[PDB]
Design a protein around this ligand. Structure first.
Ligand SMILES: O=C(Nc1cccc(-c2nnn[nH]2)c1)c1ccc2n[nH]cc2c1
Length: 263
């Protein structure tokens, strides 16, 4: 069946020229709304959530892990490191690296999270441990954002990512303290106001993690507290046919608006 919401998302996609993937979970009733929900998309920096969460999981058995220093060397800087570059020749703690990766989308910080987990496969292994059979991280920053059509590396599906984000932020994939820390980090994101958030009523609150890459890939994943009802989890992924395509955060906002209007 095709619902009214799915028809509207198809019309938005058609006018955009790209490929749109949406997954909503409404925790009011656990119902899902899916558009291309089982197709693969490049995650880009939305993968930073999984990496930070995996470090939070490690911290459950090491009370001091988040305070552990990690050396930042000049050679560690990559292409977008607004926080890490301040600390080159010094150190940042794993908490600081998590906050920088999540709230500022710092790619050096993400690489330190990946290294703490033993490489990209350590992030995948954590995904599997929390019941996500779909997620895969294959590369570090910056190359995980190449976003080539048909490339399975560094991809997931909207359905899998929405389920994972629910388990991490609202469910019990993490300890209570760690879940609360992840939610605090997501709610303090600096990069999200033009993406899913832009499509929601202003009275609502949310936390989110954006991503973008080549092929005009423009992504956002959010946990949302609407006025007067239970939380939502929403994933919006978007990718385009040309390598040099522009970002389209407005398409993510439009998708979010259609979802909000369909509740
Ligand atoms: O790191 C990239 N992008 C990047 C860096 C840091 C943050 C973000 C981002 N966060 N939220 N939305 N975009 C995106 C990026 C892009 C295109 C590439 N082609 N080949 C390697 C690439 C790397």
């Amino acid at each position: 069946q095709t619902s009214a919401v799915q028809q509207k998302l198809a019309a938005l996609e058609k006018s955009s020229g790209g490929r749109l993937g949406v997954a909503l979970i409404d925790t009011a009733d656990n119902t899902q709304v899916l558009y291309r929900g089982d197709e693969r998309f490049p995650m880009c920096s939305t993968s930073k959530v999984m990496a930070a969460a995996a470090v939070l999981k490690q911290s459950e058995t090491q009370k001091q892990l988040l305070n552990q220093p990690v050396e930042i060397k000049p050679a560690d800087l990559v292409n977008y490191n607004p926080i890490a570059e301040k600390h080159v020749n010094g150190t940042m703690t794993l908490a600081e690296l998590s906050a920088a990766a999540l709230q500022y989308s710092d790619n050096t910080a993400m690489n330190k999270l990946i290294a703490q987990l033993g490489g990209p496969g350590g992030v995948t292994a954590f995904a599997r441990a929390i019941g996500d059979e779909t997620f895969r991280l294959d590369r570090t920053e910056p190359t995980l954002n190449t976003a080539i059509p048909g490339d399975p590396r560094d991809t997931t599906t909207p359905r899998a990512m929405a389920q994972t984000l629910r388990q991490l932020t609202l469910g019990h994939a993490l300890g209570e303290t760690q879940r609360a820390q992840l939610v605090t980090w997501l709610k303090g994101n600096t990069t999200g106001a033009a993406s899913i958030r832009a499509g929601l009523p202003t009275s609502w609150t949310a936390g989110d993690k954006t991503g973008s890459g080549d092929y005009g890939t423009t992504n956002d994943i959010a946990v949302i507290w609407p006025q007067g009802r239970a939380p939502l989890v929403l994933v919006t992924y978007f990718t385009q046919p040309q390598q040099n395509a522009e970002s389209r955060r407005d398409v993510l906002a439009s998708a979010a608006r259609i979802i909000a209007e369909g509740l």
